[PDB]
Design an enzyme around this catalytic site. Structure first.
Site, PDB file in Angstrom:
ATOM      1  N   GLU A 168       0.847  -1.160   0.000  1.00 56.88           N
ATOM      2  CA  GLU A 168       0.000   0.000   0.000  1.00 56.88           C
ATOM      3  C   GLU A 168       0.895   1.227   0.000  1.00 56.88           C
ATOM      4  OE1 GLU A 168      -2.852  -0.142   3.132  1.00 56.88           O
ATOM      5  OE2 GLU A 168      -3.759   1.789   2.651  1.00 56.88           O
ATOM      6  N   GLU A 204      -2.271  11.723   2.394  1.00 55.04           N
ATOM      7  CA  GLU A 204      -3.437  11.783   3.274  1.00 55.04           C
ATOM      8  C   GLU A 204      -3.456  13.167   3.909  1.00 55.04           C
ATOM      9  OE1 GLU A 204      -4.119   8.160   5.859  1.00 55.04           O
ATOM     10  OE2 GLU A 204      -2.022   7.778   5.318  1.00 55.04           O
TER      11      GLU A 204
END
Ligand SMILES: [Ca+2]
Length: 297
Positions: free
Chosen positions: A150, A155
């Site tokens: 991942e 973010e």
């Protein structure tokens, strides 16, 4: 003319290595300048993360393309829901989770121009893949294990509310290049472990308030051991993903995820009133652009 803007954007990429040139990867590239999401290239509702982190999940209806942007809007979910669209009390907020249809994005460069929602839900741009089983022996017992990877390019969230005064780690989270890598590992019967690596060769973590303007968030996924992050075209830092379980942890291709979510460490999730302003409740993606390295001649 669907790939012209991305071709022109090569100017802004890090110089390709000697012998190589940047080439548009059409499969993960989109200007979102049409009348709708391109259903050949994107899943409006990701098939991979079907039920969000309570209390928000993901709906196709929250994903649109309008006026040059992919829009993922956060809304009150009504009626309240359990898992998989059923009535229940698990979900009362709806966000968006977009996944590329193809899942063969590997070494190369990936970038988005994003403006975060003015909201305590995430605005994100990342890549991921699904777990692969490998059999292991202990003595003399077979053990099933699973791994996946991942790659979080950005973010953020637009508003910061839950700040522990004793540990205000997230105080400026809307102004930091929060990128990350995960090598996920699990043995059968054991827990899923999130295996992370420290940042190296750091220039900056410093970023502008994510909800106030569009900014560029990019990754040069260089090889199986090395990913390099860019904010507004400038190198920020490197992460070498952890070699705990393999010498080549990022040797597998991924799909793109574009996600609007709720986090357990920010329990002041959007209220109805927080989300009444539709412009404010929306995360905007001007484009997603991917590239491959190819030999010049
Ligand atoms: Ca656009």
């Amino acid at each position: 003319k669907e790939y012209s803007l991305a071709e022109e954007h090569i100017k802004n990429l890090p110089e390709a290595p000697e012998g190589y040139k940047w080439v548009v990867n059409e499969d993960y590239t989109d200007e979102f300048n049409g009348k709708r999401l391109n259903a050949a290239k994107w899943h409006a509702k990701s098939p991979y993360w079907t039920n969000g982190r309570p209390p928000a999940t993901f709906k196709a209806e929250n994903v649109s393309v309008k006026k040059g942007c992919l829009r993922i809007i956060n809304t009150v979910l009504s009626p309240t829901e359990g898992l998989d669209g059923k009535p229940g009390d698990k979900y009362r907020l709806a966000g968006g989770a977009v996944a590329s249809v193809k899942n063969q994005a590997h070494y190369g460069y990936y970038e988005t121009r994003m403006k975060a929602s003015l909201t305590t839900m995430s605005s994100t741009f990342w890549l991921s893949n699904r777990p692969v089983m490998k059999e292991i022996m202990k003595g003399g017992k077979k053990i099933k294990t699973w791994s996946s990877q991942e790659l979080d390019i950005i973010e953020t969230m637009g508003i910061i509310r839950s700040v522990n005064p004793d540990n205000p780690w997230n105080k400026t989270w809307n102004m930091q290049m929060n990128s990350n890598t995960h090598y996920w590992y699990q043995e059968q019967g054991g827990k899923r472990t999130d295996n992370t690596a420290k940042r190296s060769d750091v220039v900056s973590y410093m970023t502008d308030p994510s909800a106030e303007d569009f900014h560029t968030y990019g990754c040069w996924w260089v090889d199986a051991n090395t990913v390099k992050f860019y904010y507004d075209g400038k190198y920020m830092y490197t992460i070498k993903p952890t070699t705990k379980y393999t010498d080549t942890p990022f040797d597998r291709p991924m799909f793109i995820h574009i996600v609007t979510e709720t986090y357990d460490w920010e329990k002041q999730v959007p209220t109805a009133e927080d989300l009444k302003d539709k412009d404010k409740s929306t995360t905007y993606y001007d484009w997603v652009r991917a590239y491959k390295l190819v030999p010049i001649e």
